């Protein structure tokens, strides 16, 4: 039977070249005798180039291949939460089967143009620099980009951790389920990752799709789609979901590897002509639906690894061009003490304030502005043998505001805590304080109001802004704390 | 089964079997040769012809020559009787001391440990090297990588770590030389012996050795790491011990593959590499790992072609490490050894929660100032130094002294530095830097800080220099 | 003060000019590396 089954003509470098299979559809899952699956990516006149999902040691010339008739779909819904699954949705945390009812297809088209509405609900990270100057809204696609080891995955993690404030809450329209896709990473990193998340009690609301370093190319390829589907189940059901693709750089490599082995034509950097289309069809599935559709959302934090800061290399160019903004991390900043290493001047949020809270805006706005102003003069500092007090002023606001954007890891803040601290320097209170102390000030200052003043923060929170009152109360709280502070 | 050779082109040999086609990865032995020639099956070309990679020279092979399927991937003698010995890619002793009488044999090809087999303990592994310890601490059971272009210190650094760590280590050690210099395996073997880590008379050997040097055909080079790693996995799993794995240089595994790649009929990926580089690296790097059964502390030297850290190979390897020591010819060029780049070296344990805030604040304190100085370098270059704020000409000072205090005379490079090797303890390091950063030595001269161990030697050296 | 003014006018104008040139040199180089790296891939692929 050459219609529903085929015979392997040759097998190598994970590409199977099957004879027969006359009825297979493009991208169909097929099965080799040995039990290994494969996906038909090249339907040629005289053969099927099949992408083997595993070790090609188990396939020989002549092995019989059969069709499944089924296209790639994966488990989905609420039972995956707190689980560690492979790219096919299989459980790899050895905790037992995932009790999944619904199964969704991994590659589906993004919701069209009509079914959506402007991104308007804040997606809070807990990171002041991001939350005040590179705001993410639900349905937005914001890229975290930077060289190796700059803090990229940390941003995502702090972000995931942060959602417990709302996940332990009652308001079900503020909860955000998290999905973390690990592509090309080593297993020890993910293990370490899931640990950090368990320790913070964030696994309860997180799903981990993992396609690691030793998993065949095709699984690394798929991973992001199969994780996307999982997040779509939430989006579609009036629920909100967050997805982190770590990294899109490694998946591009996986895809390039199959493309070239199937002999498709190579373009710049050896990438296939459809590499742009691989990510666009992925990153567009993130969106903010309309009430008519459930008002549910899917926010995506895709990671791209640049090289020597070459944001214009091929893949970094595509993805930058596809997403709504970028958080640019930099080594120089990192080693200079700015952690997280966000380059505030080049980072962006097309969505902008349409996603900031009124509380934040109340402060974010002037901060954004003195910083931009400092950035104009900063370089002068170190040779400012005699600058006027006009600009000498902006250098001072400059370094303090900058110290306020600093942040340790695993400790995401509540929007109310961020504005209280930002207010402190923005209003001028730390202007006479020593740069070397702002980190210590904030820490203790925030410890104090989180202890003693939970009623003002609750106000700020509730009233959503800084009332003329709470404004006055903060003035005293900081002018007395500061006095205390320099005793 | 018995196949015949149908084509020979370099390290690649195609074989035609009449009945029974040996599976991929199977090792075949060429009949009619003074020495054992193993061919690893690489692909099924179809027509009952397999394409294979030779584990040795292909000279004198003939079309039609006979080849027997061994029925299994390369399998080597694994067990305790490998310790103190020197092995081949294919498991043959190459030390002239007779057979290796192991109870068992293992195939060099195997699946990597599952996700549920991973461990997450993180213990700093002190080395005695100021720079590493201070800024990019190694971790027991972790994956360590020494990155460097030709001749910047990868091996010497591996040499001083064998001395400062392998030597006291209570557990085995496996040193796999992959595509490196033959002269070097002879230097190390004889050093192991002169220091009793290798014992030729008794069973007190604490190190097994495996070699596939630069004088070998691509094939051997594409596999020794596997052989090496396989020996190490035994002590990890079947004995459950604490292993120390040294590989110099893992880049050679990847260069090996790129060298036969075209003969395997593949369109090249970027920079000439083969399209399967990352996956080829992944299925290997994923076995070099600590599990719940045993612990591996791998120190891998990583060559950097053309000195370009973005080269697909060095670039693809960062993700497999928990700590990285990046060496730089720009630093070396100044006479600062070890030439580690303080701003490009990292460790997953550089966490206040793991090394402590004193350790952490010093490290970051040292890095800020070196960064601060890096930025000014290009500028005082042209515009000079007068206009600089006393605040800023002090960081130039302290930076230049730290830059030096980071160098150290290794005990394995006296032939190089003309200085006795010093090993500094973690607290002597943290403190020394803490004080320089604190302004406590702004009076001593930079030179006093160059090529010394502990901070007291910098003070003594100041006097000696005082005239 | 009139000579420092003059000297710093020039220096600044030389700098900017240098800036404009290095930038243009940067783009020429950036384009040639890509082209160069791509022709190399094609050559290898076509030879098969």
């Amino acid at each position: 039977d050459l219609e529903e089954t085929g015979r392997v003509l040759s097998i190598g470098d994970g590409i199977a070249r099957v004879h027969g299979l006359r009825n297979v559809q493009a991208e169909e899952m097929v099965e080799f005798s040995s039990g290994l699956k494969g996906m038909s990516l090249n339907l040629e006149p005289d053969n099927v180039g099949v992408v083997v999902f595993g070790n090609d040691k188990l396939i020989k010339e002549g092995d019989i291949v059969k069709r499944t008739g089924a296209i790639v779909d994966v488990p989905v819904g609420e039972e995956l939460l707190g689980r560690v699954v492979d790219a096919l949705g299989n459980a790899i945390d050895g905790k037992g089967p995932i009790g999944s009812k619904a199964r969704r297809r991994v590659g589906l088209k993004a919701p069209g143009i009509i079914p959506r509405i402007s991104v308007r609900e804040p997606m809070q990270t807990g990171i002041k620099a991001v939350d005040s100057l590179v705001p993410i809204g639900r349905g937005q696609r914001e890229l975290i980009i930077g060289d190796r080891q700059t803090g990229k995955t940390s941003i995502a993690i702090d972000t995931i951790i942060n959602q417990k404030r709302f996940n332990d809450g009652t308001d079900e329209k503020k909860k955000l389920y998290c999905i973390y896709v690990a592509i090309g990473q080593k297993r020890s990193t993910v293990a370490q990752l899931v640990k950090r998340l368990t320790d913070a009690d964030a696994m309860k609301y997180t799903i981990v799709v993992s396609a690691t370093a030793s998993d065949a190319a095709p699984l690394q390829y798929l991973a992001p789609y199969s994780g996307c589907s999982m997040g779509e189940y939430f989006r579609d059901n009036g629920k909100h979901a967050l997805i982190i693709y770590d990294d899109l750089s490694k998946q591009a490599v996986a895809y390039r590897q199959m493309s070239l082995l199937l002999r498709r034509p190579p373009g710049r950097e050896a990438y296939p002509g459809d590499v742009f289309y691989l990510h666009s069809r992925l990153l567009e599935r993130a969106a903010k639906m309309n009430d008519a559709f459930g008002g549910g959302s899917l926010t995506a934090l895709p990671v791209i690894e640049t090289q020597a800061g070459d944001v214009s290399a091929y893949i970094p160019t595509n993805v930058i061009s596809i997403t709504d903004g970028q958080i640019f991390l930099e080594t120089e900043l990192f080693y200079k003490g700015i952690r997280p290493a966000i380059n505030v001047g080049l980072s962006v949020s097309r969505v902008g304030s349409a996603a900031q809270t009124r509380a934040m805006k109340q402060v974010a706005g002037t901060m954004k502005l003195e910083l931009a102003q400092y950035r104009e003069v900063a370089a002068f500092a170190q040779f400012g043998s005699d600058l006027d007090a006009a600009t000498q002023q902006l250098l001072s606001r400059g370094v303090r505001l900058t110290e306020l954007l600093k942040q340790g890891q695993y400790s995401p803040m509540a929007i109310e805590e961020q504005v209280a601290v930002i207010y402190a320097g923005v209003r001028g209170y730390l202007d006479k304080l020593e740069p070397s102390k702002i980190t210590k000030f904030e820490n203790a200052f925030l410890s104090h109001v989180i202890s003693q003043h939970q009623a003002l923060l609750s106000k700020i929170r509730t009233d959503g802004k800084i009332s003329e009152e709470s404004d006055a109360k903060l003035k005293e709280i900081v002018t007395n704390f500061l006095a205390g502070f320099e005793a | 089964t018995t196949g015949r050779i149908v084509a020979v082109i370099g390290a690649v040999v195609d074989v035609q079997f009449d009945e029974g086609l040996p599976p991929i990865l199977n090792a075949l032995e060429v009949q009619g040769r003074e020495t054992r020639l193993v061919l690893e099956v690489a692909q099924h070309l179809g027509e009952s012809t397999v394409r294979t990679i030779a584990m040795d020279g292909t000279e004198g092979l003939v079309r039609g020559q006979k080849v027997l399927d061994s029925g299994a991937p390369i399998r080597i003698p694994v067990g305790p009787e490998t310790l103190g010995r020197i092995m081949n890619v294919i498991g043959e002793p190459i030390d002239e001391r007779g057979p290796i009488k192991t109870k068992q044999f293992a195939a060099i090809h195997a699946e990597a440990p599952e996700f549920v087999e991973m461990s997450v303990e993180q213990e700093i592994l002190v080395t005695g090297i100021k720079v590493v310890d201070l800024l990019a601490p190694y971790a027991k059971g972790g994956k360590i990588g020494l990155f460097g272009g030709a001749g910047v210190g990868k091996t010497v650094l591996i040499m001083e770590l064998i001395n400062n760590v392998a030597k006291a280590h209570g557990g085995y050690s496996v040193f796999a030389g992959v595509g490196e210099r033959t002269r070097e395996g002879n230097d190390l073997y004889h050093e192991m012996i002169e220091s009793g880590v290798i014992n030729l008379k008794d069973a007190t050997s604490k190190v097994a050795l495996v070699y596939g040097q630069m004088n070998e055909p691509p094939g051997a080079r594409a596999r020794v790491a596997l052989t090496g790693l396989t020996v190490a996995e035994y002590f990890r799993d079947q004995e459950g011990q604490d292993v120390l794995l040294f590989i110099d240089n893992i880049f050679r595994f990847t260069q090996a593959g790129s060298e036969v790649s075209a003969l395997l009929g593949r369109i090249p990926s970027a920079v000439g590499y083969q399209p399967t580089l990352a996956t080829d690296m992944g299925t290997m790097q994923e076995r070099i790992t600590t599990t719940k059964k045993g612990s591996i502390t791998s120190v891998q030297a990583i060559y950097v072609p053309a000195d370009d850290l973005t080269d697909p190979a060095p670039a693809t390897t960062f993700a497999h490490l928990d700590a990285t020591t990046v060496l730089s010819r720009a630093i070396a060029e100044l006479g600062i050894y070890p030439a580690v780049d303080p701003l490009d070296s990292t460790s997953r344990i550089m966490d206040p929660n793991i090394v402590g805030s004193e350790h952490y604040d010093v490290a970051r304190g040292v890095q800020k100032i070196l960064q601060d100085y890096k930025s000014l370098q290009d500028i005082i270059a042209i515009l000079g130094m007068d206009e600089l704020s006393e605040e800023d000409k002090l960081t130039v000072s302290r930076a230049r002294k730290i830059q030096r205090f980071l160098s150290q005379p290794f005990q394995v490079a006296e032939v190089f530095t003309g200085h006795l090797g010093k090993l500094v303890p973690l607290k002597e390091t943290i403190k020394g830097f803490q004080q320089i950063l604190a302004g406590e030595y702004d009076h001593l001269p930079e030179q006093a800080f160059y090529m010394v161990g502990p901070i007291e030697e910098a003070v003594a050296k100041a006097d000696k220099l005082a005239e | 003060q009139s000579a420092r003014m003059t000297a710093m006018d020039n220096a600044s104008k030389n700098a900017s000019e240098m800036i404009d040139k290095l930038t243009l040199t940067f783009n020429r180089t950036r384009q040639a590396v890509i082209t160069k790296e791509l022709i190399e891939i094609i050559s290898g692929a076509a030879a098969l």
């Binding site: - | 290009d378 042209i382 | 600044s12 940067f26």
Partner: peptide
């Protein structure tokens, strides 16, 4: 002519130009 070096030089000249224009005024 390395995109790295070129960038290193641009970095230091953009600052020079800035500090130098300041000193002029």
């Amino acid at each position: 002519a390395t995109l790295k070096d070129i960038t290193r030089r641009l970095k230091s000249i953009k600052n020079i130009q800035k500090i130098t224009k300041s000193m002029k005024m």
